[PDB]
Amino acid sequence: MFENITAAPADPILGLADLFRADERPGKINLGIGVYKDETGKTPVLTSVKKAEQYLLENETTKNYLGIDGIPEFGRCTQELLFGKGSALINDKRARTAQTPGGTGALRVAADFLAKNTSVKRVWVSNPSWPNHKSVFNSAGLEVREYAYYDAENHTLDFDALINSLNEAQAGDVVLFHGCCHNPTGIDPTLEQWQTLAQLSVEKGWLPLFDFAYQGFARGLEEDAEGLRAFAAMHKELIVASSYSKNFGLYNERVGACTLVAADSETVDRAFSQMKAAIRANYSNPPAHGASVVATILSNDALRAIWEQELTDMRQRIQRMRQLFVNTLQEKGANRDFSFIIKQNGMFSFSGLTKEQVLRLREEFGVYAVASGRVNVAGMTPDNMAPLCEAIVAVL
Amino acid sequence: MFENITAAPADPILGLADLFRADERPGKINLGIGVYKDETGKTPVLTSVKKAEQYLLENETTKNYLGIDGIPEFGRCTQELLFGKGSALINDKRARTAQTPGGTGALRVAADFLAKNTSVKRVWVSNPSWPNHKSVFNSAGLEVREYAYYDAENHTLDFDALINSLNEAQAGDVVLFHGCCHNPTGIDPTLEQWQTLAQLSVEKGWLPLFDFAYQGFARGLEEDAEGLRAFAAMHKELIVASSYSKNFGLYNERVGACTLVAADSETVDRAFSQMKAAIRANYSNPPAHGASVVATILSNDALRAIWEQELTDMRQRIQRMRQLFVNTLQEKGANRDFSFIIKQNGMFSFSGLTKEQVLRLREEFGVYAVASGRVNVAGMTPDNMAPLCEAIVAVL
Ligand SMILES: *Cc1c(COP(=O)(O)O)cnc(C)c1O
Numbered sequence: 001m002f003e004n005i006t007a008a009p010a011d012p013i014l015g016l017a018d019l020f021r022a023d024e025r026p027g028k029i030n031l032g033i034g035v036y037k038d039e040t041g042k043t044p045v046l047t048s049v050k051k052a053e054q055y056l057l058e059n060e061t062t063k064n065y066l067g068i069d070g071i072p073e074f075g076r077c078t079q080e081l082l083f084g085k086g087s088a089l090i091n092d093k094r095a096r097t098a099q100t101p102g103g104t105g106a107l108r109v110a111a112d113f114l115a116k117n118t119s120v121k122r123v124w125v126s127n128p129s130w131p132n133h134k135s136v137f138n139s140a141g142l143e144v145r146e147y148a149y150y151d152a153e154n155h156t157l158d159f160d161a162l163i164n165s166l167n168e169a170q171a172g173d174v175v176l177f178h179g180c181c182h183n184p185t186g187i188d189p190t191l192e193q194w195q196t197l198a199q200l201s202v203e204k205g206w207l208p209l210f211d212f213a214y215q216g217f218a219r220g221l222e223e224d225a226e227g228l229r230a231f232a233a234m235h236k237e238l239i240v241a242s243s244y245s246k247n248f249g250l251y252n253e254r255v256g257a258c259t260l261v262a263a264d265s266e267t268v269d270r271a272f273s274q275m276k277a278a279i280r281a282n283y284s285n286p287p288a289h290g291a292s293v294v295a296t297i298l299s300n301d302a303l304r305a306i307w308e309q310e311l312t313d314m315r316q317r318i319q320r321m322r323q324l325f326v327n328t329l330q331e332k333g334a335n336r337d338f339s340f341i342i343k344q345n346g347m348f349s350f351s352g353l354t355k356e357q358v359l360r361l362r363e364e365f366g367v368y369a370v371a372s373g374r375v376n377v378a379g380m381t382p383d384n385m386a387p388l389c390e391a392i393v394a395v396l
Numbered sequence: 397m398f399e400n401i402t403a404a405p406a407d408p409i410l411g412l413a414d415l416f417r418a419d420e421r422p423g424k425i426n427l428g429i430g431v432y433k434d435e436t437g438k439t440p441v442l443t444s445v446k447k448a449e450q451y452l453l454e455n456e457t458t459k460n461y462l463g464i465d466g467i468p469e470f471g472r473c474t475q476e477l478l479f480g481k482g483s484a485l486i487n488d489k490r491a492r493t494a495q496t497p498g499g500t501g502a503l504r505v506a507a508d509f510l511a512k513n514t515s516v517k518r519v520w521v522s523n524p525s526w527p528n529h530k531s532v533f534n535s536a537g538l539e540v541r542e543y544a545y546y547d548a549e550n551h552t553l554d555f556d557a558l559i560n561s562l563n564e565a566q567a568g569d570v571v572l573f574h575g576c577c578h579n580p581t582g583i584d585p586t587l588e589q590w591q592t593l594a595q596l597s598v599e600k601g602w603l604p605l606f607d608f609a610y611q612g613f614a615r616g617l618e619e620d621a622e623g624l625r626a627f628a629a630m631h632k633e634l635i636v637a638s639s640y641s642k643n644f645g646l647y648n649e650r651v652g653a654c655t656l657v658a659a660d661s662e663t664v665d666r667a668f669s670q671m672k673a674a675i676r677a678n679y680s681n682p683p684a685h686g687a688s689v690v691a692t693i694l695s696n697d698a699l700r701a702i703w704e705q706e707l708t709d710m711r712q713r714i715q716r717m718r719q720l721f722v723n724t725l726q727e728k729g730a731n732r733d734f735s736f737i738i739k740q741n742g743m744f745s746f747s748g749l750t751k752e753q754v755l756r757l758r759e760e761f762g763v764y765a766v767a768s769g770r771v772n773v774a775g776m777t778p779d780n781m782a783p784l785c786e787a788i789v790a791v792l
């Protein structure tokens with residue numbers, strides 16, 4: 001019987017999508033998007049992945065089931081990407097990877113594993129964080145507490161407020177860290193802050209969980225991983241949920257991984273069998289296409305070279321738009337100090353607009369941003385930059 | 397901390413897989429498989445789906461996210477397949493479909509929806525049923541009770557034992573029905589038994605849940621759906637979890653659907669928004685490739701004609717192997733009455749071997765079957781039929 005079923009709440013970002021595509025004005029700019037767009041305003045499929053897909057089409061002979069944890073080459077390629085090509089974690093075989101449906105699937109199977117096999121009751125998420133983090137852990141019945149993160153005034157990482165909230169977390173509490181390109185703020189810990197965090201975590205008995213969705217968008221693939229690697233040098237156990245949605249432009253093929261690391265090569269196998277049991281009772285075994293694309297790009301040097309170039313071009317495009325935004329706002333002129341945008345990493349940052357200012361942006365100018373003032377920098381193109389900055393200067 | 401984590405139990409069928417592929421004898425036959433195989437012993441990718449994939453490769457311009465419920469054409473094609481091309485359910489818009497990662501994903505999001513939004517506490521599953529049914533519902537915290545189904549003696553549907561167990565189910569309990577090709581037995585209700593079941597269900601207040609994984613393997617696409625359609629004529633609400641894994645040979649692309657039907661066009665939307673919320677907290681939005689393949693085959697008549705022929709050829713191959721098995725056992729000769737195999741539908745049936753007899757099959761003859769005596773008829777080829785029947789006659 002379903003007549004007393006309460007409609008689910010209006011989706012905190014998709015509402016803007018539907019609202020946007022009902023405006024009769026092409027001067028309208030949607031900076032609320034969440035996905036990368038190139039200078040043309042389009043989300044292309046990469047050249048390297050169309051090459052990989054022609055290859056798969058020429059060479060696949062069966063669509064028979066992958067094992068629960070997916071394609072093995074995909075697994076070894078992702079823990080080399082994560083941990084570095086000769087890491088002790090990999091040589092001692094203390095990491096196991098399950099291929100999952102995107103980074104969100106990786107977080108739900110991590111959550112289900114934890115809820116069914118360990119005694120964790122709370123996951124600490126930054127304030128702010130990606131909003132679907134609360135939903136994911138709560139559906140497995142983990143409670144979500146949040147730690148201080150953002151300084152709204154200097155638009156930076158309030159590190160002392162952050163370590164001071166974390167002293168409320170007990171041993172065996174899970175603390176979620178964004179690997180790089182913190183969503184929504186774009187502020188990430190410096191390597192020195194990652195190390196003190198790696199060290200305080202070990203002392204206090206935090207189980208670290210990295211949400212690593214943007215490898216390659218802050219600085220480069222290896223550099224973006226130095227934070228996770230600092231925890232991994234120091235921790236016997238950790239979980240990283242990574243996603244290939246954004247750095248391979250493979251969003252809708254759902255390709256991600258859930259890597260479990262344990263003290264040794266044998267407790268990780270014992271724990272991984274239950275992670276596998278958690279996957280079997282959810283979607284059974286993972287979608288092969290997008291993970292086969294990633295595995296064949298990364299293991300083929302000609303293809304990986306091309307991918308790498310397509311990714312530093314996406315990274316550079318975003319860094320150019322953060323730069324063009326800050327001084328185009330300084331040509332259109334307002335009491336501002338939007339330069340903090342040049343310090344933030346990846347596609348998102350809080351613009352510092354009030355909810356009323358984003359409201360007259362949507363309403364009076366057709367500039368759509370998320371009510372928190374979060375803007376997706378990749379929705380800026382050299383051509384739409386000047387109408388955007390005008391609209392913004394006119395509401396400040 | 398993971399050192400007290402108990403290893404998950406040895407997988408009830410995959411153990412045979414690993415055991416099989418460690419035999420030095422190519423006379424070895426694995427009838428434990430679960431996937432379809434053709435006369436060559438191979439699980440090919442269909443011609444229609446390689447054609448659909450060349451088309452997608454030529455024509456996709458983005459991998460941007462599908463909406464939570466997936467591609468809309470895939471949704472309308474599956475509820476026409478399920479309900480018939482002009483069904484009142486479709487014209488009154490009382491059905492909504494979410495594209496899911498396989499039929500197992502469709503069952504976990506049905507389970508999560510139910511556990512979070514309704515007051516169901518128990519799901520009735522046949523005894524026997526597909527073993528991952530218990531796991532799926534239990535991970536959402538629904539308890540699984542089982543109803544009588546199989547008569548081990550006459551190898552048939554013990555219908556009176558079945559309606560007599562079901563009288564233990566209260567109103568608002570969920571009762572799971574296999575749409576056709578009951579796994580593991582291959583015995584399905586006749587249309588007359590579906591109708592009395594449709595009628596008793598409505599009286600008693602059962603929420604019916606169809607697990608519909610084998611459309612097209614018993615009789616034809618339309619005929620295989622007449623059981624579900626009889627419930628759907630009579631019910632205001634029902635859920636069907638369907639899978640395209642087997643009838644499209646798309647196993648590892650994870651393509652399935654979860655269809656929710658409610659009294660009207662507006663309570664189904666209200667309920668569907670929460671089903672959507674249950675998807676967002678699990679894998680976010682579904683894998684596009686395999687569902688794009690199904691949607692383009694089914695909406696293109698030249699491609700659908702080809703698919704249809706490839707599916708009646710898979711159906712016919714299985715019906716020929718059930719027939720060749722029964723009289724090859726009657727040429728090799730033993731006190732048998734294996735003719736019940738000719739009455740069962742789809743790829744599986746219980747052979748009626750004891751667990752000790754399947755054990756000396758694996759051990760002494762290299763014939764691998766599941767310990768319950770379940771055999772996958774599609775693992776029989778005209779060439780391996782005679783060694784198989786010999787091994788079997790020699791253990792009876
Ligand atoms: C995009 C994102 C994810 C995962 O996305 P998928 O589409 O599920 O791969 C996880 N965490 C954060 C912070 C993200 O921004």
Ligand SMILES: *Cc1c(COP(=O)(O)O)cnc(C)c1O
Binds near residue numbers: 284579647
């Ligand atoms: C195969 C099967 C499913 C679903 O399989 P997926 O691979 O997840 O599509 C569901 N129920 C039964 C009875 C099955 O045999």
